[PDB]
Amino acid sequence: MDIQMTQTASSLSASLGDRVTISCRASQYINNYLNWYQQKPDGTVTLLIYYTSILHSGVPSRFIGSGSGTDYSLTISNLDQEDIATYFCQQGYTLPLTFGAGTKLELKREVKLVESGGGLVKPGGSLKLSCAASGFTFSTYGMSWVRQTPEKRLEWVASISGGGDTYYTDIVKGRVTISRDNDRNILYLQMSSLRSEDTAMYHCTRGALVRLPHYYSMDYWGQGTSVTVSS
Ligand SMILES: COc1ccc(-c2cc(Cl)c(Cl)c(Cl)c2)cc1Cl
Numbered sequence: 035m036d037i038q039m040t041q042t043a044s045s046l047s048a049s050l051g052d053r054v055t056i057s058c059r060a061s062q063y064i065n066n067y068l069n070w071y072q073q074k075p076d077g078t079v080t081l082l083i084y085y086t087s088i089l090h091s092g093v094p095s096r097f098i099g100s101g102s103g104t105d106y107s108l109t110i111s112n113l114d115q116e117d118i119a120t121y122f123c124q125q126g127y128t129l130p131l132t133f134g135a136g137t138k139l140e141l142k143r144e145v146k147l148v149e150s151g152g153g154l155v156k157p158g159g160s161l162k163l164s165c166a167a168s169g170f171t172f173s174t175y176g177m178s179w180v181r182q183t184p185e186k187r188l189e190w191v192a193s194i195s196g197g198g199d200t201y202y203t204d205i206v207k208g209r210v211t212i213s214r215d216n217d218r219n220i221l222y223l224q225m226s227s228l229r230s231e232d233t234a235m236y237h238c239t240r241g242a243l244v245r246l247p248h249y250y251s252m253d254y255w256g257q258g259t260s261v262t263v264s265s
């Protein structure tokens with residue numbers, strides 16, 4: 035069954051210099067295969083921590099990731115203006131990949147992925163999303179689509195290995211097809227028979243293999259392309 039990730043706090047209110055702790059609970063054991071993402075106010079998503087406690091490139095040791103079993107946390111000390119953002123945890127232990135609903139921090143008082151092809155369609159319509167990749171050896175990396183719903187949740191849609199193996203979340207199976215062109219360095223999502231609940235911003239992400247056989251982090255995110263499905 036699906037692993038539910040729970041972030042009990044939807045927002046925490048803090049002052050500059052404060053220390054804040056964001057909880058993340060898994061509904062079952064995830065073997066410490068927990069990633070944390072930061073989404074800035076402008077929508078940009080970056081990887082923050084992977085494998086519970088390993089800091090991603092560029093992240094200062096003011097951030098500490100902790101936890102085991104089902105109980106995890108992210109602590110940010112010496113809170114800075116640049117930390118005002120929404121933080122999401124994500125388990126990478128079993129499919130479907132699942133995210134917590136996010137915890138916003140509020141104050142009191144190179145590699146490129148570019149998505150295109152979104153649009154507005156009626157239920158039952160079709161769209162082809164594209165993600166142009168540059169700045170890395172595209173054919174060696176797993177790639178994914180992750181959508182952000184109007185309620186601001188992150189939902190994994192599909193992933194494809196460098197060699198073309200594919201994986202989908204159940205609710206899109208048989209309705210979308212992920213594919214890639216390793217000569218043109220483009221990732222695709224063909225969407226058919228669209229449904230209203232598919233309305234979301236679709237982000238393409240690069241997967242970094244953390245531990246075999248298939249524990250990944252999403253180490254780079256595009257800004258997304260919007261899909262709207264309306265009667
Ligand atoms: C059987 O379990 C799995 C199979 C595949 C993937 C998976 C996750 C990501 Cl993010 C990428 Cl990019 C890829 Cl290519 C595969 C993950 C799991 Cl847990």
Ligand code: NA
Pocket residue numbers: 047140141
């Ligand atoms: Na507030």
